[PDB]
Amino acid sequence: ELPSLEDLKVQEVKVSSSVLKAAAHHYGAQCDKPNKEFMLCRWEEKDPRRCLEEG
């Protein structure tokens, strides 16, 4: 299958509890360039193994 490394990506994932993220819709306006480029990579190439660098 050839899986990704044990170190993986992102150190200390997620901020805190849920609903907190859903409370602010300002996350759409500010910081959109990394979110859209990850979205553009993932629909073109369905594999999570390739577009993990953008994530």
């Binding site: 997620k14 993220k21 859903a22 819709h25 996350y27 759409g28 979110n35 990850f38 979205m39």
Partner: protein
């Protein structure tokens, strides 16, 4: 002196009087309030559903905004 049961009529209690009569409702006037409540009913309800649309699009926007999810 002789004392017997005495006769008394006074008002005669009114022999056969009609009590049933038309009250409140007339006919055509009830339809003006009846269908009038319906037209007021839809107009008040549909304005709330347009206000629901303000919430609806904003709710689905949260999913699009959340990509780390």
């Amino acid at each position: 002196x002789x004392x017997x049961x005495x006769x008394x009529x006074x008002x005669x209690x009114x022999x056969x009087x009609x009590x049933x009569x038309x009250x409140x409702x007339x006919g055509y006037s009830m339809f003006a309030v009846g269908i009038g409540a319906l037209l007021f009913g839809y107009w008040s309800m549909m304005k709330w559903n347009r206000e629901r649309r303000r919430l609806q699009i904003e709710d689905f926007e949260a999913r699009i905004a959340l990509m780390p999810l």
